[PDB]
Amino acid sequence: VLKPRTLADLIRILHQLFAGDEVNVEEVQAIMEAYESDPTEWAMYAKFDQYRYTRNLVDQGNGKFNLMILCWGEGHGSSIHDHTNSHCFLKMLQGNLKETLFAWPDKKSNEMVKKSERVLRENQCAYINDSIGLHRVENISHTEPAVSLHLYSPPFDTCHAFDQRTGHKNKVTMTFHSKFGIRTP
Amino acid sequence: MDVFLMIRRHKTTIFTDAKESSTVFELKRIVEGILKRPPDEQRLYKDDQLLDDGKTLGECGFTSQTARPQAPATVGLAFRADDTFEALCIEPFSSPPELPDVMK
Amino acid sequence: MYVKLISSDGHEFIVKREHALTSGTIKAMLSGPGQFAENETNEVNFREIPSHVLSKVCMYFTYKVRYTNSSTEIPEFPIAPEIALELLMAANFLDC
Amino acid sequence: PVLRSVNSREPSQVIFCNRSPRVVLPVWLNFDGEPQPYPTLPPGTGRRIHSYRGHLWLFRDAGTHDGLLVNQTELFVPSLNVDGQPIFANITLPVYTLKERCLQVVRSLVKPENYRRLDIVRSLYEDLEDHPNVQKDLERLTQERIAH
Numbered sequence: 091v092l093k094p095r096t097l098a099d100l101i102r103i104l105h106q107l108f109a110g111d112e113v114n115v116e117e118v119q120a121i122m123e124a125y126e127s128d129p130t131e132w133a134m135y136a137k138f139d140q141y142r143y144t145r146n147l148v149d150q151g152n153g154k155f156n157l158m159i160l161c162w163g164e165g166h167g168s169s170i171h172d173h174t175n176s177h178c179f180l181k182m183l184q185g186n187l188k189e190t191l192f193a194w195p196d197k198k199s200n201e202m203v204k205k206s207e208r209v210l211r212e213n214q215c216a217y218i219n220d221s222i223g224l225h226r227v228e229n230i231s232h233t234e235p236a237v238s239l240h241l242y243s244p245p246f247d248t249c250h251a252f253d254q255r256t257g258h259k260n261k262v263t264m265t266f267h268s269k270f271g272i273r274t275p
Numbered sequence: 276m277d278v279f280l281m282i283r284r285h286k287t288t289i290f291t292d293a294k295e296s297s298t299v300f301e302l303k304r305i306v307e308g309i310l311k312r313p314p315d316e317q318r319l320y321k322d323d324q325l326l327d328d329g330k331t332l333g334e335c336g337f338t339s340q341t342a343r344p345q346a347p348a349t350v351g352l353a354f355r356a357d358d359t360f361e362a363l364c365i366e367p368f369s370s371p372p373e374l375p376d377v378m379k
Numbered sequence: 380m381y382v383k384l385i386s387s388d389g390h391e392f393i394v395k396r397e398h399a400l401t402s403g404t405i406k407a408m409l410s411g412p413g414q415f416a417e418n419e420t421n422e423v424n425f426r427e428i429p430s431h432v433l434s435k436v437c438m439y440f441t442y443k444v445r446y447t448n449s450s451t452e453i454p455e456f457p458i459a460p461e462i463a464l465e466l467l468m469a470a471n472f473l474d475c
Numbered sequence: 476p477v478l479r480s481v482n483s484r485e486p487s488q489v490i491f492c493n494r495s496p497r498v499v500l501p502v503w504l505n506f507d508g509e510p511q512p513y514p515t516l517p518p519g520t521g522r523r524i525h526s527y528r529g530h531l532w533l534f535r536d537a538g539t540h541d542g543l544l545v546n547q548t549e550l551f552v553p554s555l556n557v558d559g560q561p562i563f564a565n566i567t568l569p570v571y572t573l574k575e576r577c578l579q580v581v582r583s584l585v586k587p588e589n590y591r592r593l594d595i596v597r598s599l600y601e602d603l604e605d606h607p608n609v610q611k612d613l614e615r616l617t618q619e620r621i622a623h
């Protein structure tokens with residue numbers, strides 16, 4: 091194990107890892123889990139919206155990978171989404187989120203099937219791609235917020251939203267609440 | 276509960292307060308303490324209606340939201356000549372210049 | 380306890396003394412050796428402040444005295460746009 | 476930086492209560508002392524929010540950045556929830572000076588490009604342009620606390 095001493099250290103390590111020819115997603119996840127969340131080191135990216143969660147870009151990663159921080163209010167949650175064939179890592183900096191994994195749709199409209207459902211405790215880091223299925227992440231807490239650290243490689247502006255009742259798609263293009271600590275309306 | 280008033284006559288206007296539950300006579304008592312005329316030589320109006328000495332100010336129309344510190348209500352005042360009373364006379368304040376177009 | 384404030388157009392405004400000391404310049408006038416001797420009349424002539432703004436100024440006086448120690452909620456002091464410019468000049472002069 | 480939140484990680488539930496006529500902007504001061512804004516509160520609304528002991532808050536007009544009071548001071552630091560009862564932060568108007576209240580009003584009506592087209596003594600042009608700002612107030616507040 092290589093234990094990141096700071097958030098900046100974890101970012102320097104990730105840039106090296108994604109510069110190599112082969113990315114080993116087991117080692118990326120392990121090293122992101124290893125960094126012990128320290129709010130003094132990421133508080134500038136923690137910006138909250140009352141109504142939805144916020145996307146706060148941190149590092150665009152030399153075009154090979156994206157690094158974002160998402161901020162979840164009480165009761166805030168994602169839609170059922172895909173990952174446009176890119177790896178995706180999710181690490182908890184503060185709070186908890188419930189990941190509910192869905193299988194893809196059979197062609198005629200019917201309510202999609204929950205494969206699994208788990209809670210992500212603090213400092214835990216998860217991995218997802220379209221090979222494992224589609225998920226939806228929510229902050230279950232009625233009283234506390236959630237802050238998560240996302241890595242997506244390759245970076246993507248596009249993906250698809252899924253109606254749980256039918257399974258039919260609507261594809262979205264994702265906003266950014268902030269970029270590098272600065273509000274972008 | 277306090278009401279806030281401007282007692283007005285000619286070019287004289289008094290800024291004072293009173294309780295909604297205090298009476299019109301009691302108000303003449305303090306007008307006496309300022310312009311030194313007894314309440315029997317005083318007439319108090321709300322717009323055009325003379326006010327009963329024994330009616331409480333809340334009962335004449337001066338209340339919490341009608342007579343506020345930043346927007347006091349107006350009480351007209353008329354003195355007695357020495358036989359009977361003068362007509363209620365209040366000169367309005369000056370008027371501001373018409374709004375600069377730079378302020379819409 | 381009451382003092383008389385006179386406007387440029389000759390309107391007399393009698394307000395409580397401790398109300399008028401809301402004004403920094405009035406407080407400078409009347410708290411030191413400029414206090415009215417009893418042989419004098421408690422009048423201050425403001426020969427460049429018209430009555431429609433001077434009356435507004437004493438409305439602020441009562442407002443400030445009433446809500447300075449309020450502890451849970453205070454209203455907003457309303458200013459019409461027509462008097463805003465003239466009121467701002469009187470406030471700069473009166474230092475309040 | 477003296478006006479900073481301490482990284483306590485000891486949570487503290489708080490009630491923000493806007494009893495002003497303005498749209499209130501809660502402003503948190505991070506651990507480096509820089510301000511970061513939070514969702515706006517409409518007039519009359521209260522919300523129970525998540526915070527921590529030792530964190531510094533202040534509150535402004537969301538549109539004009541006019542300063543607001545909170546329990547009749549300008550800075551708010553929660554203690555620890557004794558017995559799990561919430562901490563209350565009561566947001567009010569301050570009693571502005573007449574001058575600062577008119578400057579608020581005419582900034583509300585004329586665009587800054589046109590302040591100096593107003594026939595007022597130029598002493599008040601610079602005053603108009605001295606728009607309320609929160610790090611100018613931080614400047615004052617830190618140097619108010621140095622002088623105990």
Ligand SMILES: CC(=O)N[C@H](C(=O)N1C[C@H](O)C[C@H]1C(=O)NCc1ccc(-c2scnc2C)cc1)C(C)(C)C
Pocket residue numbers: 129130132133136138140163184235237482484491501503513514515516522524525526527530
């Ligand atoms: C461990 C720590 O100090 N975490 C900080 C934290 O959680 N803070 C800082 C302040 O104490 C407030 C608290 C926070 O961000 N709480 C979430 C929150 C979301 C919305 C709101 C508001 S303000 C007006 N309306 C709402 C809904 C207030 C707080 C962050 C994540 C920003 C580094």
Ligand SMILES: [Fe+2]
Pocket residue numbers: 171172173178218225
């Ligand atoms: Fe996802």
